[PDB]
Amino acid sequence: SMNPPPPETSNPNKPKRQTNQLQYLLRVVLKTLWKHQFAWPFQQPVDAVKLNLPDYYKIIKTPMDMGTIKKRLENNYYWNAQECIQDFNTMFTNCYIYNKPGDDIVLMAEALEKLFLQKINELPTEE
Ligand SMILES: Cn1cc(-c2cc(S(C)(=O)=O)ccc2OCC2CC2)c2cc(-c3cn(CCF)nn3)ccc2c1=O
Numbered sequence: 001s002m003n004p005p006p007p008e009t010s011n012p013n014k015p016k017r018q019t020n021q022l023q024y025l026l027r028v029v030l031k032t033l034w035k036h037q038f039a040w041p042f043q044q045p046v047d048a049v050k051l052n053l054p055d056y057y058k059i060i061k062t063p064m065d066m067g068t069i070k071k072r073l074e075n076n077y078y079w080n081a082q083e084c085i086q087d088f089n090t091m092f093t094n095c096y097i098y099n100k101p102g103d104d105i106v107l108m109a110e111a112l113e114k115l116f117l118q119k120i121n122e123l124p125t126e127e
Pocket of ligand 1: 040041042043044045046047048050052053085094098099104105108126
Protein backbone atom coordinates (compact mmCIF):
# COMPACT_ATOMS: atom_id res chain seq x y z
CA SER A 1 0.00 0.00 0.00
CA MET A 2 1.22 3.55 -0.65
CA ASN A 3 0.55 6.97 0.66
CA PRO A 4 0.28 9.89 -1.78
CA PRO A 5 2.90 12.60 -1.76
CA PRO A 6 2.06 15.04 1.02
CA PRO A 7 0.64 18.49 0.28
CA GLU A 8 3.36 20.93 -0.70
CA THR A 9 4.77 23.19 2.00
CA SER A 10 6.86 25.37 -0.33
CA ASN A 11 6.60 26.29 -4.01
CA PRO A 12 9.18 28.22 -6.06
CA ASN A 13 6.54 30.10 -8.04
CA LYS A 14 4.01 30.95 -5.31
CA PRO A 15 4.32 34.50 -3.98
CA LYS A 16 4.96 34.63 -0.27
CA ARG A 17 3.97 37.08 2.39
CA GLN A 18 3.93 37.59 6.15
CA THR A 19 1.00 39.57 7.54
CA ASN A 20 0.09 40.29 11.14
CA GLN A 21 -2.83 37.90 10.71
CA LEU A 22 -0.52 35.14 9.48
CA GLN A 23 1.73 35.71 12.51
CA TYR A 24 -1.28 35.49 14.83
CA LEU A 25 -2.27 32.27 13.08
CA LEU A 26 1.10 30.67 13.84
CA ARG A 27 1.68 32.22 17.28
CA VAL A 28 -1.84 31.97 18.76
CA VAL A 29 -3.99 29.65 16.67
CA LEU A 30 -1.65 26.86 15.55
CA LYS A 31 0.08 27.07 18.94
CA THR A 32 -3.16 26.60 20.89
CA LEU A 33 -4.20 23.66 18.73
CA TRP A 34 -0.80 21.94 18.41
CA LYS A 35 -0.37 21.48 22.17
CA HIS A 36 -3.96 20.29 22.73
CA GLN A 37 -4.38 16.74 23.97
CA PHE A 38 -6.23 15.81 20.77
CA ALA A 39 -3.76 17.40 18.34
CA TRP A 40 -1.55 14.40 17.65
CA PRO A 41 -3.68 12.57 15.01
CA PHE A 42 -3.62 15.81 13.05
CA GLN A 43 0.08 16.68 13.45
CA GLN A 44 1.12 14.84 10.26
CA PRO A 45 -0.59 13.62 7.08
CA VAL A 46 -2.82 10.59 7.50
CA ASP A 47 -0.50 7.58 7.10
CA ALA A 48 -2.97 5.28 5.42
CA VAL A 49 -0.34 2.56 5.12
CA LYS A 50 0.51 2.41 8.82
CA LEU A 51 -3.15 2.76 9.86
CA ASN A 52 -4.33 0.17 7.30
CA LEU A 53 -6.85 2.55 5.71
CA PRO A 54 -6.67 1.43 2.07
CA ASP A 55 -9.65 3.57 1.12
CA TYR A 56 -8.56 6.79 2.84
CA TYR A 57 -7.04 8.44 -0.25
CA LYS A 58 -9.73 6.99 -2.49
CA ILE A 59 -12.25 9.13 -0.58
CA ILE A 60 -10.10 12.08 0.52
CA LYS A 61 -8.54 13.80 -2.52
CA THR A 62 -7.68 17.13 -0.81
CA PRO A 63 -5.87 15.95 2.33
CA MET A 64 -4.65 18.42 4.92
CA ASP A 65 -3.12 18.26 8.41
CA MET A 66 -1.68 20.69 10.97
CA GLY A 67 1.90 19.56 10.29
CA THR A 68 1.52 20.80 6.74
CA ILE A 69 -0.13 23.99 7.98
CA LYS A 70 2.68 24.59 10.50
CA LYS A 71 5.33 24.21 7.80
CA ARG A 72 3.40 26.45 5.40
CA LEU A 73 3.24 29.15 8.09
CA GLU A 74 6.89 28.76 9.04
CA ASN A 75 8.03 28.78 5.39
CA ASN A 76 5.84 31.85 4.60
CA TYR A 77 4.07 29.79 1.94
CA TYR A 78 0.85 31.73 2.24
CA TRP A 79 -0.06 35.13 0.87
CA ASN A 80 -2.98 35.69 3.23
CA ALA A 81 -4.68 34.38 6.34
CA GLN A 82 -7.72 33.13 4.43
CA GLU A 83 -5.59 30.53 2.67
CA CYS A 84 -4.52 29.18 6.06
CA ILE A 85 -8.04 29.27 7.50
CA GLN A 86 -9.13 27.29 4.43
CA ASP A 87 -6.49 24.62 5.11
CA PHE A 88 -7.78 24.21 8.68
CA ASN A 89 -11.34 23.87 7.39
CA THR A 90 -10.22 21.28 4.84
CA MET A 91 -8.56 19.27 7.59
CA PHE A 92 -11.72 19.26 9.70
CA THR A 93 -14.11 18.59 6.85
CA ASN A 94 -12.01 15.67 5.58
CA CYS A 95 -12.31 14.10 9.03
CA TYR A 96 -16.08 14.40 9.05
CA ILE A 97 -16.38 13.06 5.48
CA TYR A 98 -14.24 9.96 5.93
CA ASN A 99 -15.20 8.98 9.48
CA LYS A 100 -18.45 8.19 11.31
CA PRO A 101 -20.20 10.08 14.12
CA GLY A 102 -19.15 8.84 17.52
CA ASP A 103 -15.73 7.84 16.18
CA ASP A 104 -12.97 8.95 18.52
CA ILE A 105 -11.25 10.89 15.74
CA VAL A 106 -14.43 12.85 15.02
CA LEU A 107 -14.83 13.79 18.67
CA MET A 108 -11.19 14.97 18.66
CA ALA A 109 -11.74 17.05 15.50
CA GLU A 110 -14.88 18.66 16.92
CA ALA A 111 -13.04 19.76 20.06
CA LEU A 112 -10.12 21.15 18.08
CA GLU A 113 -12.47 22.91 15.67
CA LYS A 114 -14.30 24.55 18.56
CA LEU A 115 -11.02 25.94 19.88
CA PHE A 116 -10.02 26.93 16.35
CA LEU A 117 -13.18 29.00 15.85
CA GLN A 118 -12.79 30.61 19.27
CA LYS A 119 -9.24 31.69 18.42
CA ILE A 120 -10.01 32.98 14.92
CA ASN A 121 -12.97 35.00 16.20
CA GLU A 122 -10.35 37.46 17.52
CA LEU A 123 -8.21 37.37 14.38
CA PRO A 124 -6.72 40.88 14.42
CA THR A 125 -7.76 43.28 11.68
CA GLU A 126 -5.11 43.37 8.98
CA GLU A 127 -2.46 46.06 9.20
C1 LIG B 1 -7.39 12.85 10.50
N1 LIG B 1 -7.32 11.43 10.91
C2 LIG B 1 -6.20 11.00 11.67
C3 LIG B 1 -6.07 9.60 12.14
C4 LIG B 1 -4.80 9.25 12.89
C5 LIG B 1 -3.62 9.45 12.18
C6 LIG B 1 -2.43 9.14 12.78
S1 LIG B 1 -0.95 9.43 11.83
C7 LIG B 1 -0.75 11.22 11.70
O1 LIG B 1 0.21 8.82 12.48
O2 LIG B 1 -1.11 8.88 10.48
C8 LIG B 1 -2.37 8.65 14.07
C9 LIG B 1 -3.55 8.46 14.77
C10 LIG B 1 -4.78 8.74 14.17
O3 LIG B 1 -6.03 8.63 14.76
C11 LIG B 1 -6.01 8.04 16.07
C12 LIG B 1 -7.52 7.81 16.38
C13 LIG B 1 -7.83 7.58 17.85
C14 LIG B 1 -8.23 8.91 17.16
C15 LIG B 1 -7.16 8.63 11.74
C16 LIG B 1 -7.07 7.28 12.17
C17 LIG B 1 -8.09 6.43 11.78
C18 LIG B 1 -7.98 4.97 12.23
C19 LIG B 1 -8.82 3.91 11.88
N2 LIG B 1 -8.30 2.87 12.49
C20 LIG B 1 -8.82 1.49 12.46
C21 LIG B 1 -7.64 0.57 12.82
F1 LIG B 1 -6.55 0.88 12.04
N3 LIG B 1 -7.19 3.21 13.18
N4 LIG B 1 -6.98 4.55 13.01
C22 LIG B 1 -9.17 6.86 11.03
C23 LIG B 1 -9.28 8.19 10.60
C24 LIG B 1 -8.24 9.07 10.98
C25 LIG B 1 -8.36 10.54 10.52
O4 LIG B 1 -9.29 10.96 9.93
